[PDB]
Short mmCIF file of C-alpha atoms and ligand atoms in Angstrom, two decimals:
data_model
loop_
_atom_site.label_atom_id
_atom_site.label_comp_id
_atom_site.label_asym_id
_atom_site.label_seq_id
_atom_site.Cartn_x
_atom_site.Cartn_y
_atom_site.Cartn_z
CA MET A 1 38.78 -64.52 85.40
CA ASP A 2 35.69 -67.28 84.62
CA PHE A 3 35.69 -66.58 81.54
CA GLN A 4 32.80 -69.65 81.47
CA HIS A 5 31.09 -68.60 84.76
CA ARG A 6 30.46 -64.98 83.96
CA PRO A 7 26.43 -63.88 82.84
CA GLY A 8 25.67 -64.90 79.16
CA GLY A 9 26.51 -61.56 77.47
CA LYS A 10 26.20 -61.75 73.29
CA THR A 11 28.43 -58.96 70.72
CA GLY A 12 25.97 -56.60 68.68
CA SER A 13 23.05 -57.28 71.20
CA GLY A 14 21.50 -53.69 71.71
CA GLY A 15 20.42 -54.24 74.88
CA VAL A 16 17.15 -54.14 77.06
CA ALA A 17 13.91 -52.33 75.73
CA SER A 18 12.75 -49.05 77.26
CA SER A 19 9.74 -48.95 79.24
CA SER A 20 7.53 -47.26 76.01
CA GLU A 21 9.38 -49.83 74.32
CA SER A 22 8.32 -52.95 76.94
CA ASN A 23 4.79 -50.82 77.89
CA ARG A 24 3.81 -51.02 73.45
CA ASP A 25 5.20 -54.38 73.07
CA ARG A 26 3.00 -55.58 76.05
CA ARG A 27 0.22 -53.57 74.66
CA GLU A 28 0.55 -55.54 71.69
CA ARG A 29 1.03 -59.25 73.09
CA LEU A 30 -2.21 -58.01 75.24
CA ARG A 31 -4.23 -57.50 72.42
CA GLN A 32 -3.13 -60.41 69.94
CA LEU A 33 -4.01 -62.82 73.40
CA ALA A 34 -7.50 -60.76 73.08
CA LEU A 35 -8.00 -61.44 69.46
CA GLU A 36 -6.71 -65.39 70.10
CA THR A 37 -9.94 -65.93 72.49
CA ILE A 38 -11.98 -63.62 70.66
CA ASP A 39 -11.51 -65.89 67.45
CA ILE A 40 -11.00 -68.92 70.04
CA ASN A 41 -14.32 -67.81 71.71
CA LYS A 42 -16.11 -66.90 67.98
CA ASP A 43 -18.00 -64.27 68.95
CA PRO A 44 -19.20 -62.26 66.24
CA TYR A 45 -19.82 -58.57 68.33
CA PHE A 46 -16.67 -57.45 68.27
CA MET A 47 -15.59 -54.64 65.89
CA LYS A 48 -12.14 -53.52 65.43
CA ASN A 49 -13.25 -48.75 63.67
CA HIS A 50 -11.57 -47.19 61.22
CA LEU A 51 -9.86 -45.28 64.53
CA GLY A 52 -9.12 -48.20 66.51
CA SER A 53 -11.28 -49.40 68.47
CA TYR A 54 -13.25 -51.89 69.90
CA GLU A 55 -16.83 -52.03 69.83
CA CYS A 56 -19.57 -54.16 70.07
CA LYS A 57 -22.25 -54.65 67.69
CA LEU A 58 -24.46 -56.41 70.05
CA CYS A 59 -24.88 -54.33 73.04
CA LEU A 60 -23.41 -51.10 70.34
CA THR A 61 -19.89 -50.59 73.11
CA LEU A 62 -17.48 -48.86 72.83
CA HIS A 63 -13.62 -50.58 74.82
CA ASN A 64 -10.88 -48.27 75.95
CA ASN A 65 -8.57 -51.45 76.30
CA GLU A 66 -8.88 -54.90 75.31
CA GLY A 67 -9.37 -56.00 78.40
CA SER A 68 -12.78 -53.63 79.14
CA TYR A 69 -13.96 -55.84 75.91
CA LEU A 70 -12.30 -58.98 77.44
CA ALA A 71 -15.00 -58.26 80.63
CA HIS A 72 -17.63 -57.72 79.03
CA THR A 73 -19.60 -61.14 78.58
CA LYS A 74 -25.13 -56.81 81.01
CA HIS A 75 -24.00 -58.05 77.28
CA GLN A 76 -26.53 -61.29 77.73
CA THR A 77 -29.52 -59.17 78.33
CA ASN A 78 -28.40 -56.88 75.28
CA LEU A 79 -28.20 -59.64 73.62
CA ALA A 80 -31.20 -61.19 74.60
CA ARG A 81 -32.90 -57.53 73.20
CA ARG A 82 -31.11 -57.25 70.24
CA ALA A 83 -31.91 -61.06 69.41
CA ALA A 84 -35.81 -59.66 68.18
CA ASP B 1 -51.02 -49.22 47.89
CA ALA B 2 -47.36 -46.64 47.99
CA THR B 3 -45.08 -50.10 48.61
CA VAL B 4 -44.30 -51.94 44.97
CA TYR B 5 -42.43 -55.37 44.95
CA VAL B 6 -39.75 -54.82 41.84
CA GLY B 7 -38.28 -57.90 40.40
CA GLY B 8 -37.18 -58.86 37.29
CA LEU B 9 -33.37 -58.53 38.03
CA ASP B 10 -29.53 -58.98 38.46
CA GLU B 11 -26.61 -59.48 41.04
CA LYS B 12 -26.15 -56.00 39.46
CA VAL B 13 -29.37 -54.06 39.73
CA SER B 14 -28.86 -53.05 43.85
CA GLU B 15 -31.19 -51.42 46.07
CA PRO B 16 -28.41 -48.23 44.78
CA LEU B 17 -29.23 -49.34 40.99
CA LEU B 18 -32.97 -49.14 42.11
CA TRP B 19 -32.72 -45.87 44.36
CA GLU B 20 -31.06 -44.57 41.52
CA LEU B 21 -33.80 -46.07 38.26
CA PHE B 22 -36.79 -44.39 41.47
CA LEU B 23 -35.22 -40.42 41.11
CA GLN B 24 -35.18 -41.33 37.09
CA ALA B 25 -39.01 -42.22 37.33
CA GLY B 26 -40.36 -41.99 40.25
CA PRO B 27 -39.42 -41.15 43.97
CA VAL B 28 -39.56 -43.92 46.98
CA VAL B 29 -39.72 -43.48 50.65
CA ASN B 30 -38.33 -46.50 51.98
CA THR B 31 -36.48 -49.74 50.12
CA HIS B 32 -37.05 -53.69 52.01
CA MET B 33 -35.03 -55.82 50.46
CA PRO B 34 -33.93 -58.11 53.34
CA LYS B 35 -31.10 -60.90 52.33
CA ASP B 36 -30.45 -64.55 53.64
CA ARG B 37 -27.72 -65.19 56.60
CA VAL B 38 -25.39 -67.89 54.42
CA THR B 39 -25.84 -66.27 51.08
CA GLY B 40 -26.37 -63.15 51.54
CA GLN B 41 -27.31 -61.20 48.38
CA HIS B 42 -28.95 -59.30 46.31
CA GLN B 43 -32.27 -61.38 44.51
CA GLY B 44 -33.06 -58.20 42.38
CA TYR B 45 -36.22 -58.02 43.94
CA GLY B 46 -37.49 -55.76 46.54
CA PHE B 47 -40.31 -53.61 48.12
CA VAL B 48 -39.89 -49.58 47.00
CA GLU B 49 -42.48 -47.94 49.87
CA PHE B 50 -43.36 -45.09 47.16
CA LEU B 51 -44.70 -41.63 49.26
CA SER B 52 -46.86 -41.54 47.19
CA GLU B 53 -49.64 -44.31 45.52
CA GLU B 54 -49.66 -42.76 42.19
CA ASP B 55 -45.43 -43.51 41.75
CA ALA B 56 -45.64 -47.14 42.78
CA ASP B 57 -48.57 -46.48 39.78
CA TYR B 58 -46.13 -45.35 37.31
CA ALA B 59 -43.69 -47.17 38.52
CA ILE B 60 -46.21 -50.27 38.28
CA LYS B 61 -47.38 -49.53 34.28
CA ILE B 62 -45.17 -47.15 32.67
CA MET B 63 -41.48 -48.54 34.93
CA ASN B 64 -42.31 -52.04 34.05
CA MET B 65 -40.95 -52.58 31.15
CA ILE B 66 -36.71 -51.20 31.48
CA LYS B 67 -34.05 -53.44 31.45
CA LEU B 68 -32.67 -54.37 35.55
CA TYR B 69 -29.07 -55.70 34.92
CA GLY B 70 -29.59 -57.91 31.43
CA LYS B 71 -33.28 -58.75 32.97
CA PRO B 72 -36.87 -57.18 32.30
CA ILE B 73 -37.79 -55.71 35.66
CA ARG B 74 -41.21 -55.63 36.22
CA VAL B 75 -42.71 -54.04 39.49
CA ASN B 76 -45.75 -55.29 41.38
CA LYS B 77 -48.88 -53.77 43.40
CA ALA B 78 -47.80 -54.72 46.93
CA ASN C 1 -48.33 -13.93 73.88
CA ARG C 2 -47.42 -14.33 70.70
CA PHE C 3 -49.02 -15.57 67.15
CA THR C 4 -49.20 -18.39 65.01
CA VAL C 5 -47.37 -20.07 62.20
CA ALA C 6 -50.20 -19.01 60.07
CA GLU C 7 -49.90 -14.75 60.66
CA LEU C 8 -46.20 -15.49 60.85
CA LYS C 9 -46.26 -17.02 56.67
CA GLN C 10 -48.60 -13.87 56.02
CA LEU C 11 -46.09 -11.25 57.83
CA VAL C 12 -43.28 -12.72 55.87
CA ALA C 13 -43.14 -12.47 51.68
CA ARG C 14 -41.23 -16.36 52.68
CA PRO C 15 -43.01 -18.62 54.09
CA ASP C 16 -40.61 -21.50 54.29
CA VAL C 17 -37.93 -19.82 56.01
CA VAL C 18 -40.97 -19.90 59.32
CA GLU C 19 -39.30 -22.79 60.94
CA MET C 20 -41.72 -24.70 63.48
CA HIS C 21 -40.89 -23.21 66.48
CA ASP C 22 -40.39 -19.74 65.76
CA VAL C 23 -42.49 -18.22 66.76
CA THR C 24 -42.47 -18.64 70.75
CA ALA C 25 -39.13 -16.23 69.10
CA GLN C 26 -39.07 -12.81 71.44
CA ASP C 27 -38.01 -12.11 67.63
CA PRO C 28 -39.98 -13.65 65.12
CA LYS C 29 -40.30 -11.23 62.77
CA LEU C 30 -36.49 -10.39 62.31
CA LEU C 31 -35.89 -13.57 62.84
CA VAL C 32 -38.68 -14.24 60.05
CA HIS C 33 -36.42 -11.76 58.14
CA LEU C 34 -33.43 -12.43 58.49
CA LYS C 35 -33.53 -15.92 57.60
CA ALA C 36 -35.73 -15.13 54.03
CA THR C 37 -31.94 -13.25 52.89
CA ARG C 38 -29.43 -14.86 50.00
CA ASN C 39 -26.55 -15.79 52.58
CA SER C 40 -28.42 -17.33 55.56
CA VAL C 41 -26.92 -20.82 56.55
CA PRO C 42 -29.73 -22.49 59.00
CA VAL C 43 -29.12 -23.44 62.17
CA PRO C 44 -27.07 -27.69 63.01
CA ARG C 45 -29.92 -30.22 63.55
CA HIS C 46 -27.71 -31.20 66.81
CA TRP C 47 -29.97 -27.95 69.61
CA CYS C 48 -33.18 -29.93 68.52
CA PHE C 49 -31.44 -33.86 69.37
CA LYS C 50 -29.92 -35.42 72.27
CA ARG C 51 -27.52 -37.07 70.50
CA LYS C 52 -24.32 -35.08 70.55
CA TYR C 53 -22.62 -33.98 67.03
CA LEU C 54 -21.32 -37.21 65.57
CA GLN C 55 -20.78 -39.05 68.18
CA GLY C 56 -23.55 -42.48 67.76
CA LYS C 57 -22.00 -43.75 65.06
CA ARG C 58 -20.37 -46.69 67.72
CA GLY C 59 -21.30 -49.89 65.74
CA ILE C 60 -19.77 -49.24 61.56
CA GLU C 61 -16.84 -49.23 59.64
CA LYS C 62 -15.10 -46.67 57.65
CA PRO C 63 -12.44 -46.67 55.06
CA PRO C 64 -9.20 -45.28 56.17
CA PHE C 65 -7.81 -42.39 53.49
CA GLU C 66 -8.24 -42.22 49.52
CA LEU C 67 -5.17 -40.30 48.67
CA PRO C 68 -4.35 -37.94 46.09
CA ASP C 69 -3.03 -38.79 42.22
CA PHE C 70 0.14 -36.68 42.72
CA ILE C 71 0.24 -38.76 46.28
CA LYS C 72 -0.02 -42.16 44.76
CA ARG C 73 1.46 -41.14 41.44
CA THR C 74 4.96 -40.29 43.92
CA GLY C 75 3.64 -43.96 44.91
CA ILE C 76 4.84 -43.04 48.86
CA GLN C 77 2.56 -45.67 49.65
CA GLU C 78 4.60 -49.10 47.67
CA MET C 79 7.69 -49.26 50.11
CA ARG C 80 6.20 -47.50 53.36
CA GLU C 81 4.06 -50.63 53.46
CA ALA C 82 7.29 -52.80 52.61
CA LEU C 83 8.27 -50.69 55.26
CA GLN C 84 5.38 -51.84 58.18
CA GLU C 85 5.29 -55.33 56.53
CA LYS C 86 8.55 -55.37 57.30
CA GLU C 87 9.22 -54.27 61.09
CA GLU C 88 6.12 -56.28 61.49
CA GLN C 89 7.91 -58.99 60.90
CA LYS C 90 11.06 -57.91 62.85
CA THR C 91 11.70 -58.79 66.69
CA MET C 92 12.64 -56.57 69.66
CA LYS C 93 16.48 -57.86 69.12
CA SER C 94 16.05 -57.20 65.45
CA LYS C 95 14.63 -54.05 67.06
CA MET C 96 17.67 -52.55 68.69
CA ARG C 97 19.61 -53.96 66.75
CA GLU C 98 19.02 -51.76 63.78
CA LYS C 99 19.18 -48.88 66.26
CA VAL C 100 22.51 -49.40 66.89
CA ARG C 101 23.20 -50.38 63.64
CA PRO C 102 21.45 -48.37 61.60
CA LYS C 103 20.29 -48.83 57.98
CA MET C 104 20.05 -45.95 55.13
CA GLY C 105 19.28 -45.55 51.83
CA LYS C 106 15.58 -47.32 52.25
CA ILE C 107 13.40 -45.02 49.49
CA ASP C 108 16.24 -42.42 48.88
CA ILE C 109 14.69 -41.92 45.19
CA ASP C 110 15.19 -37.87 44.68
CA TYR C 111 14.36 -34.70 45.49
CA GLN C 112 12.32 -34.19 41.74
CA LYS C 113 9.01 -36.61 41.71
CA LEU C 114 8.08 -34.58 44.77
CA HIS C 115 8.71 -31.11 43.78
CA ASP C 116 6.85 -31.93 40.56
CA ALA C 117 3.63 -33.33 42.15
CA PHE C 118 3.91 -30.14 44.75
CA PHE C 119 3.65 -27.79 41.96
CA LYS C 120 3.58 -29.09 38.40
CA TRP C 121 0.92 -31.91 39.03
CA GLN C 122 -0.58 -30.56 41.49
CA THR C 123 -4.28 -29.91 41.24
CA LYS C 124 -6.97 -27.74 42.65
CA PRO C 125 -9.50 -30.33 43.79
CA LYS C 126 -13.67 -29.91 44.68
CA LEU C 127 -14.30 -27.51 47.69
CA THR C 128 -18.36 -27.64 47.87
CA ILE C 129 -19.97 -23.92 48.38
CA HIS C 130 -20.61 -21.13 51.21
CA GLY C 131 -24.28 -21.80 52.42
CA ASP C 132 -22.83 -25.88 52.34
CA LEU C 133 -23.24 -27.23 56.07
CA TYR C 134 -21.84 -31.39 57.44
CA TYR C 135 -24.27 -33.24 59.04
CA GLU C 136 -24.72 -36.56 60.46
CA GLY C 137 -25.40 -37.71 56.68
CA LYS C 138 -23.87 -35.09 54.00
CA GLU C 139 -22.79 -38.91 52.37
CA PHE C 140 -24.66 -40.56 50.81
CA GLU C 141 -27.89 -38.17 48.56
CA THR C 142 -25.26 -37.17 45.67
CA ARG C 143 -27.80 -36.94 43.44
CA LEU C 144 -27.74 -33.08 43.83
CA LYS C 145 -28.08 -37.12 39.22
CA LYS C 146 -30.84 -34.88 38.23
CA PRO C 147 -34.33 -36.28 37.92
CA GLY C 148 -35.63 -37.58 35.00
CA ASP C 149 -32.08 -38.53 33.84
CA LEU C 150 -31.14 -42.27 34.14
CA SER C 151 -28.15 -43.65 35.36
CA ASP C 152 -25.41 -44.98 33.06
CA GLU C 153 -25.32 -47.78 34.39
CA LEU C 154 -29.15 -48.66 34.31
CA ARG C 155 -28.43 -47.39 30.67
CA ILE C 156 -25.27 -50.13 29.98
CA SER C 157 -27.22 -52.73 31.76
CA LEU C 158 -30.55 -51.78 29.65
CA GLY C 159 -28.38 -51.49 26.62
CA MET C 160 -29.50 -48.08 25.71
CA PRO C 161 -26.81 -45.90 23.52
CA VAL C 162 -25.69 -42.35 23.50
CA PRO C 163 -32.40 -44.70 22.73
CA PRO C 164 -34.05 -46.65 25.73
CA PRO C 165 -36.35 -49.08 25.76
CA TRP C 166 -38.74 -47.49 28.21
CA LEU C 167 -38.34 -43.78 26.58
CA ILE C 168 -40.91 -44.94 24.63
CA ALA C 169 -43.28 -45.73 27.08
CA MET C 170 -41.25 -42.95 29.42
CA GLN C 171 -42.75 -40.59 26.54
CA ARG C 172 -45.96 -42.57 25.72
CA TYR C 173 -46.95 -42.47 29.13
CA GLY C 174 -45.89 -38.49 29.74
CA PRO C 175 -44.69 -36.76 32.82
CA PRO C 176 -44.71 -38.73 35.99
CA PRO C 177 -46.57 -37.94 38.78
CA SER C 178 -44.02 -38.91 41.27
CA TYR C 179 -41.92 -35.81 40.00
CA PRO C 180 -44.02 -33.38 38.17
CA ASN C 181 -40.90 -30.55 38.05
CA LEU C 182 -38.82 -33.09 36.09
CA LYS C 183 -38.76 -32.32 32.80
CA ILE C 184 -37.21 -35.01 30.72
CA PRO C 185 -35.18 -33.77 27.65
CA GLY C 186 -35.02 -35.49 24.33
CA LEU C 187 -38.67 -36.50 24.53
CA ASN C 188 -40.55 -34.11 26.97
CA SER C 189 -38.28 -31.05 26.92
CA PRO C 190 -35.60 -31.09 23.47
CA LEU C 191 -29.10 -33.51 27.66
CA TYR C 192 -25.37 -33.91 27.86
CA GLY C 193 -23.62 -37.28 29.49
CA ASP C 194 -25.87 -39.71 31.53
CA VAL C 195 -27.98 -36.40 32.45
CA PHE C 196 -30.38 -36.92 29.45
CA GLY C 197 -32.96 -34.50 31.66
CA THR C 198 -33.50 -32.83 34.98
ZN1 ZN D 1 -21.78 -57.26 74.73
#
């Protein structure tokens, strides 16, 4: 057989991860991307709870997902209200 | 003159240490100890609003002789 | 239709147990009689609040956990955190490689240390009273530190041996007007440890 034209595979691989492992890896990567964009934007309103949840201290609003806080950018009117 | 300015302290004497000294000596209803936005450290002087003017008078007269964190704490009427 | 707080204070032997809105109850005298017994508990404060119970924090941070002394004396936290930090740097290629080729003997300490920490090193913890009711605070006012007694940190900071420098002025000034029922031992009521008064 064409050994140099078979699809590539290596011994001792372990296989492809399941849906749950890929889902939690995607969630961890989304958390890392959200933290990278928060550190790039340098927003001090972001906080992580003791139970591990996103919180807007300028809005005082909890967020279930990272994109919930990423869409929380109302926040300008709440920042103007909490400025004084 | 329920509010009394308490100073002459150091970084070890904080708002909770002043609250413990108040619970020893004379009760204070509120505490006002603002801090800077860059340093964020206690200056040792804060406005303790007492529940009565006699408590602030006893803090200014009798309790203004302690050594809070090595420095002599002085309470003045405010 | 219902009497005022003065009639409830005169009728009941305990006027301090009469609430502000207890007069609008259908049986205010029976509620005052039930509230005046030795083994009663108050209503939790959330019935008057619009806020739900322990719900409106929303912005504070807390420490995660404080383990007891025998569990930390077994020391499971050290290699547990080492294993978590080692697994955090692993890739998913290495994760399924370890899944198909496992490596045991990670902790592998003994059974006798956990048996001793469960039984020989078992310590009874601190439990509160039967009438205690936790609320939104109940974690900060731990003085119930007696009044009329200086703290140990203030005694160490002012150089008070166990003679404070302001104790002579406190003895010459009499009792403070903020706490007239507080008695300071050693100078006014002639005091073990830092609690030199009550
Ligand atoms: Zn916001």
